[PDB]
Structures are given as structure tokens and as C-alpha cells.
Amino acid sequence: DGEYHSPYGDDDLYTVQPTERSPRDPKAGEDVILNITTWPIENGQDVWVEWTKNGVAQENVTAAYDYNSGNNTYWKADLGKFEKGDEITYTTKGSTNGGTAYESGPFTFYVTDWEYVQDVTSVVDNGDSITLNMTATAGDFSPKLYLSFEDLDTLRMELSPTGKETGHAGKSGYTVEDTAEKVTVTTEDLSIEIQKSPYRMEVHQADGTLLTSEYTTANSLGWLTDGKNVINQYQNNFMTPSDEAFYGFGERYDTINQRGKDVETYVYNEYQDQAQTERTYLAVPFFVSANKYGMYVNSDFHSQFQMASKVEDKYSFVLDNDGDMTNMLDYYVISGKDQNDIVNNYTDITGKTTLLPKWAFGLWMSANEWDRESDVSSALSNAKANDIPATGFVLEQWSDEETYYIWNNATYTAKKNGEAFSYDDFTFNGKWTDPKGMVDSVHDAGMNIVLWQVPVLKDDGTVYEQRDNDEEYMISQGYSADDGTGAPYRVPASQWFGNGILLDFTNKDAVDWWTSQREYLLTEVGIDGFKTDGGEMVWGRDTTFSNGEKGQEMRNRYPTDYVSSYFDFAKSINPEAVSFSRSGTSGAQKSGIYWSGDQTSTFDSFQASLKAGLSASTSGVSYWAWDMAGFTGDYPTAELYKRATAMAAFAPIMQFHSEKSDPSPSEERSPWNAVARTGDETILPTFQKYLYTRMNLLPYIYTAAKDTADNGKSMMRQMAMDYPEDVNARDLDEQYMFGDDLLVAPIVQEGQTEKEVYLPEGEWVDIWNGGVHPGGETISYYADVDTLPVFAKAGAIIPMNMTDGYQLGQNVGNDLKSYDNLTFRVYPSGDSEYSFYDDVNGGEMRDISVSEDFANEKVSVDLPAMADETTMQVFSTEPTSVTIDGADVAKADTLDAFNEATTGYYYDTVQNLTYVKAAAKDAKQAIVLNGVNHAPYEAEFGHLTNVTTASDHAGYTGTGFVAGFDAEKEAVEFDIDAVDGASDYTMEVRYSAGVEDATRTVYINGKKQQITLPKTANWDTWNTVEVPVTLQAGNNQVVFDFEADDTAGINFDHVVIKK
């Protein structure tokens, strides 16, 4: 028999327990209901509430029967409404037939209401900080708002409602213009305009451009208080135009643009339907606006971002607090040189991404079902047999499933008092007879291994000696958090690892103990890190951690304290160790890889994963992975598998994984198992193509990884991060930038083969075939199930590790300590420069520069000193000569000859690439290609109308030519860029006309001319005629038509634009 009421229950944001107070934190005028339970269900029960208001005893409130469920009766007691300042203390009671009264409480709540800033009464400039003394709209406080500069382009606001706290110092490079009506604070990067009566702030760039501004009606800034000693929430409100887009907020699965939504900064473990529930494991109170600023609310407490979700021109943040009136509101308005610089400034505040070793950027293999040595050996054997040179290996089902630090089937003498084991304490049996040997075999295969972990000590009520000993010790030492009553905090019963005891990662002694138990795994077994899963496990209002903080503040921070603790520990022992986690908040980026969690194998999930990666990126979490093609649900289709593979190969971290622990047939998301499950053998060569291409691009990818760590530029970015002004880039969620120079457009729709790609300003070249696409429009790209549209930005310099075949998608292996043929792929356009991170040769920075001068038929490359032979692949027409330091280098007629030569050049007519080989020298080398023009615009890649392509006459450039083009209504249209601005140019038209002289009609931006194409000796002989054209800057429409007055058949190879 009993009674129970607990006002906050588990303090879950989304649900309530059936015995809570509603509202949990009452405001003035809100009716207060107490939900109370009794058991068993029995006639003769009475439930009531004994209480005081401002210390005065009130008449008891009688509860009314609500409903019965299970062994319990539920009741509601109505306390009524209260006024601001009221302090209510109550005890709930239940009895049967006037007998033993069971009770809960006392519980106290302080009734609140909002107070807002009114006017600025005085301004004090302290040199490194500005104090604005203010009045309030209500109450007796004298608030102070402190302004400071984290940097000249990053403004910090700290609000003390009572005026008793002081803000932090910042930079002193600012000036102030203080007048009776307004104060303007200026730096070389910002102009902050503050109206004094009423108080209202606008943040502008130095030149005056508005970044954001507090809502028009002012009184925008406020706090929720009882007017005495409780401050429970803060808010500010801002004006936003109807076109403003909001990105980031951590990792989001529903949309990349949060306009219209209430975004909760609240970590949560939501399985499979993250998009639909709008939940996430990784929540960060930071967003980037395409209006060129970021806003970071510096608090671990839950916050709600109302992004034009209430009023169409208003966005707001509402930040919770634990009552403590000394906790100031602290937020930043972040400007920068560009959107990526904004993110860099954010990482100055919350932490830089820690550069991971290069092995982290190869393929990771994982499957929950791998649970014994024979599974590992078969996994390694299958990878080798299928030519899959992975670099990472994950084991989840490796332990006793009890302590999570002892190998499954290991036997030993149990240890008391939390003593740590060493490798020699164990007798290894059954599934794992030689863990050290097993790790040695993984290392032998060129891979590194990580082991799965959780931050909780399991307690499912079953007896298990070592786990029981550990629990006893942990409790005696206070290594758990406190439930608020002196007992250890346990995960709520109905949750993942319910009843388990969380390790208090804020407790250094606790962390030292916990990690000591895993030490032998790094020092003796030789593992390369941990897959630190979970962490979204902190509930309860009164839950208390060693640092004095409670559940409200610690829920979002806990996962990152957990993940960082393990990352640092593993790395302290093994410098090459890497963590792989799913949960966190601001700062998560300092500590390893984050994967998108648990999703099903559908295209809808794929779409959600892509959004999660793009949002995480904006939020500073660059080293992001996902379970490619999904880890659970029905096995993926061959189509999904192939589409997922392609995106994954061009994502920051590439990893396959599966959920099932012991299925039949296998659930592995490996390519060999995908072939087995779907019956589609073509999956293997398609997977190989993408894996091999990723490894060819590893120098570029790893340099990008370094750029994240040093400069805050995420590896994979939503289009508006690079092009914030471009109205077509705002909502794109099915394409992205990868590194600085690649535009990747995965197909994420079932059945799709015509893929739309928005190309921003500039020229974009298909990296697979050399097709040229002018920017500033949406193109349609035909992509079969094996094809991924990827384009290089104009001026791009891309380092690659190539085989002697020199094609993308050729297996170079997984050697991370040497290159095969280090190659630089170059798309000349003006003057371009790239800093290559040569990690193979000591991490030296190699500064490469390219100067395009097609106006004079030259492209120059300034190659710095290199440790290795270097191959340039320059997109251009064929040179008449190539020089290195002024000396001619020999033309190689075939690829074989080029490979045998120590220096020389070779022209690839199919890709329109000039290969140039330079010897390794401890001095810079000046390479010049002479007689070159911009690469041809291949006819077979133009817009074709009623005409087809062929390859059945030798001598063409590209993949072939347009065949015949000999009837009315047949057309070939080109999108041609003016190589050097608006001007006249010469257009070369390369064709064959074996039978007789021909004519075609050409329109240049609608201006017609007829061209004569004289007969060639035969269809195996090509000729080129020069046509004068006038081009405008940018894209030019060049249409070749066969009109009524034209004549004869031709084969049409390409066109070249030149001076």
C-alpha cells in the first residue's frame, strides 16, 4: 500500500509521468494541478494536499478520482492559480478508512512572471568591456548588460538581471559614440547601434549592412522570475525578413533550414524516426544565418529556438535556468569574412576539431553480428578476396555483455574494490581465445580497431559477480551522480539501460577509475579507440553531479564529458586512437567522429542522413559518418546500396554497419554480403569504383580534414555555406560541397535517373569525363544507378594518389605512408593557389600555384620542392611544347612511354588532360604548357536535339562525336564561357565531312552566321575551321542547327574557344 507524487517526474521534455505537477514550473495566473497515485485499488481511499502559501497554512485541498490503471488509482488535486512571488509548499497524502497516511513531499515552487529590459540609463566604457545600466519593465531589479569582443567580429552579450554579476573582459580594439538617445560601438568589422529609450540593439557590419536586430517593438530581452531569489528562464527576440534561412542547431534530420520551426536544444535517443519526431542525439545552441551571422547561446541548459514559428517576422530563443539568480545569460553574435569563417569563430569559442590520423578517413567495416574470432577472420578474408582495402574495423559484440570491459567467455578471479585487471589475469576461451592475436591480424590487414562502450554500469537485477563488485565500489565512492536524495542516480526503468548507474564524468576520480578498468585494452590488447555509444541518459530535475550542476544543465553536456573523457584517455596511451560517437553538444567536435545513429534501409532515411550531415557541418561537427544504406530494416535494395555507396565515398567518414546480433541470413552491409542478399553481382564493381576513387582522392580529403582542424571549414557543406547570397542555394539538401573544390550531387530518390544539379557561379567540370558546365543554373544530369555527378570548381587544384593507369577508380590500395603516383588535377582559371598537406612527408605544407593565361596560350604551374615525383593533369587542349625551368620536356606518345620517362608530357584525348611529370627536386620548379587553350567543349556532351552520338571513326577528342547532324530540326547546343570576359573570340569547329562540302548555321546568343565546312578526304579525316564569334562575360548560348538552306552530313567532334 502506498501513495506517490513527484512534481517533475523524469523531467522529460516530450512526455510526462502520471504523477507530476502541471505546469511543472507555474507562472502567475496558471491553474496548478497535482497528479497523485495510490495503491492498491480499494474502496475507502481519501487523497488530499496539506500546504502553505508564503508560509501561511492553507485549507487542505481534496483530490478527485481521475482513473484506474493496473494496481493503481490516479487522482487530481487542484491548487488553483497564484500570483508572481508566491511561494507554495505542499505535501500530498493518501489514506484508506482514516488509517495510515502515506505521503510525498514537501515540495516547493516559486511563482514567476516575465520582466524585460526597458531603457538604458547610463553607459560605462571600461576599455575591455562596456556596461549598459538599465531599467526594467516590472519588478525591483537594476539590470546590467555587458558587451565585450571575443574578437573584433565576434560580439558577446552578458546579462545580469539583478546587476550583481559582472561580464568578462574582451578585446579593446573598439570605439564608442555615446549620446543621450543612442550608443554606437564600432570595430573595423562591426557597428553595433543601441537605442537607449527603449533599449534596442542592431548589429551591422562595419559598412552598415544589417546582420540582425532585436524585435521592432523593443522590450525584447527578458527573464522569468519570482522577483526574489529565482530566475527560471531567459529570452530575447529578433526581427527577421521573410527570406532569411537558418542553418545548423547541431545535427538535424527533418530539414537543413529551420525557418518555421521551434527547435529544441535537447539531446535524445530516438530510434529510426528522428526526422518525423524532429529529435536528435546531437543538439547545439548555435545557428548560422544566410544573412551572414551566427548566434551562439552559451549554455548547456535546454533552449527553444522559435524560428519565425510564432510570428512570421520574429525569431526568439527561450533558455531554461535552474533558478540560480547568479547565472547570467551569455550569447554571441558572430560575424566573419565568410560563412565558414563564422563557423571558425564559433570553434574559437567552443573548441577546434582535433585532427584525426589518416586511417580514420578510409573505409570503416562494422557489423553487430561479428561476435567471435572466426567472424573476424572471415570478415578480413572476405575484404581481401573482394579487393576491399579498408582501414577501420569495429567490434560491438565483443564483451561479456555485463561489465563491458572483459572479453566474452573470458574466465578469471573476480576483483573487489574496483581493482583493474591486466591481460595476464584472464584465461581467454570460446569466442575469443587470443584477443591480442586477433587485433594483430586486423593490424596485419592494414586496419585499426575500435571497441564499443556505454557510459553506464548495467544493472538488470541479475547476479553477476564482477558487475556486482563494481557497482558496490562505485556506490561507496560516490562515482555515480546523485538522485537528489543521496542514492545513486539510475537511468529511468523504461529507457535503454534502464536501472543502470551512470558514471559521473564530471568526477575526475570516477573517470580515472572507469578508464583504469579499460586500460589493458589499449596497453596490452592494442586497440585503436572506442565506439562510445549512448549518453542521452540524464533525466530528473534533482539529479546532481560532482561539479554541483543538476539534471537540467547536465543533460546536454553529459554525452560530451563522456565522449571527451574516453577520447583523451585512449589518445594518452595510443596517439593514433580515434573515437566514434553519436551524442553531444557544443564542444563535441574536439573529440572524434560522430555518426548519424540508427536508421532504416530506405531512401527516406538516406535523405534524412544527408540532412543530418549538412546540419552537423554548419554546427562545427565536420568528421561525420552515417551507416551507409541504413543499418536495420529490410535489407537494402541493390539500387539503394549503390546510391548510398556513392554518397558515402564522398562523405567525411565512410562506414558500413548493421544492427542484428545473430541473423540468418547475414545482415552485413558489406559489398560481398550485399551481392549475396540481392543477387546483383554488379554491386561489387560499383562499390570498388567508389572506394578506389575515395582512396585516389585521399590526399585531397586529408588536406580538407586538416583545413577543418585549423580553419573551421567543414569537409561536407550545404551550398549556402559557400554561396549565401545565391537564392537558388538556400534550401538545397540533395547536393553539397566536399572539400573546397568538389560539388557532389547524390541521387537520394528511389527510381531516379535524371538528377537536377544547381550549379553556382563559375564553370564546373565533370571529374569523371571532362564535360564542361557553366554556372548559374540548374542542369539535368543523366545518372544511371552506377553514376554520381561530381564537378570541379574553376581553378581547382586537386591532389590525388594514382596508379600507373592514372584514371579515377583504379585501386591504389590502403598504404597511408607513401604515394604511388602523386598527381595534381588542375582546372585552370585565372590565378589559383592550393596548400597541400603532405602528411606522407612529415606533414610539410606544399604551396602550389597555377597561372592560367589562355589569352597567350599558356598555363604556368609553380611547383614547390617535393619529396616525390609529381604528375600534373591539366585540363586543356594539347600543348605544342612543355617546359620545366625553361627546358623542353619530351612528348610521350603513349601512357606506357610516359610511365617509363623520368620527365615529359602526354595528352589524354578522352579526358582532355595534359599529363606533366616532374622529377623530385629540393627546389621549386617552373612548369609551362605552351600553345594550349581551354579544353574543348565536346559535341557529344552538348544539348542534343534529334541527333545521336557515335565513336566509330578514329581521331575524335572526348568519347566520340555527334553523328550526321544532317536534317532540319537537328541541333547541338553548347553552354560556352568567355575565357577572359566580354570580347570577340575565335571558335574552332572540329568535324569530318567525308562526302562533300557542308554548311551549318550557328547562333551566338541569338545572332546567326552560316559556316562552311569543306569536305575531308574521308570519314577518318578531321578538319578544323575557325569561326569569329562575339561573347559576353560568363555563359554564352551557342547553337548549331541544320536549317533548310544547309547541306551535307558531318560528324561533329568539338569546339574550342580561343583568342
Ligand SMILES: OC[C@H]1O[C@@H](O)[C@H](O)[C@@H](O)[C@@H]1O
Ligand atoms: O485533517 C483533515 C484531512 O483528513 C483526511 O482524513 C481527510 O480525508 C482529508 O480530506 C482532510 O483534509
Ligand SMILES: OC[C@H]1O[C@@H](O)[C@H](O)[C@@H](O)[C@@H]1O
Ligand atoms: O511493489 C509496490 C509497487 O506497487 C505499484 O502499484 C506502485 O505504483 C509502485 O510504485 C510500487 O513500487
Ligand SMILES: OC[C@H]1O[C@@H](O)[C@H](O)[C@@H](O)[C@@H]1O
Ligand atoms: O515567444 C516567447 C514565449 O514563448 C512561449 O512559448 C513561452 O511559454 C513564453 O513564456 C515566452 O514568453
Ligand SMILES: OC[C@H]1O[C@@H](O)[C@H](O)[C@@H](O)[C@@H]1O
Ligand atoms: O539496435 C541498437 C539500438 O537499440 C535500441 O534499443 C537503443 O535504444 C539504441 O540506443 C541502440 O542504438
Ligand SMILES: OC[C@H]1O[C@H](O)[C@H](O)[C@@H](O)[C@@H]1O
Ligand atoms: O471514485 C471512485 C473510487 O475511488 C477510489 O477507488 C476510492 O477509494 C473509492 O471509494 C471510490 O469509489
Ligand SMILES: OC[C@H]1O[C@H](O)[C@H](O)[C@@H](O)[C@@H]1O
Ligand atoms: O553487443 C553490444 C551492444 O550492441 C547493441 O547495439 C545493443 O544495443 C546492446 O544491447 C549490446 O550490448
Ligand SMILES: OC[C@H]1O[C@H](O)[C@H](O)[C@@H](O)[C@@H]1O
Ligand atoms: O545472459 C547474459 C550472458 O550472455 C552470454 O552467455 C555472455 O557470454 C555472458 O557473459 C552473459 O552473462
Ligand SMILES: OC[C@H]1O[C@H](O)[C@H](O)[C@@H](O)[C@@H]1O
Ligand atoms: O564475474 C562473474 C564470473 O565471470 C567469469 O565467469 C569468472 O571466471 C568467474 O570467476 C566470475 O564469478
Ligand SMILES: OC[C@H]1O[C@H](O)[C@H](O)[C@@H](O)[C@@H]1O
Ligand atoms: O558532364 C557530361 C555528361 O556526363 C554524363 O554523360 C551525363 O549523363 C550527362 O548528363 C552530362 O552532361
Ligand SMILES: OC[C@H]1O[C@H](O)[C@H](O)[C@@H](O)[C@@H]1O
Ligand atoms: O551521313 C553521315 C554519315 O556518313 C557515313 O555513313 C559515316 O560513316 C558516318 O559516320 C556519318 O555520320
Ligand SMILES: [Ca+2]
Ligand atoms: Ca568529341
Ligand SMILES: [Mg+2]
Ligand atoms: Mg470515502
Ligand SMILES: [Mg+2]
Ligand atoms: Mg523534401
Ligand SMILES: [Mg+2]
Ligand atoms: Mg576569426
Ligand SMILES: [Mg+2]
Ligand atoms: Mg556472429
Ligand SMILES: [Mg+2]
Ligand atoms: Mg598500437
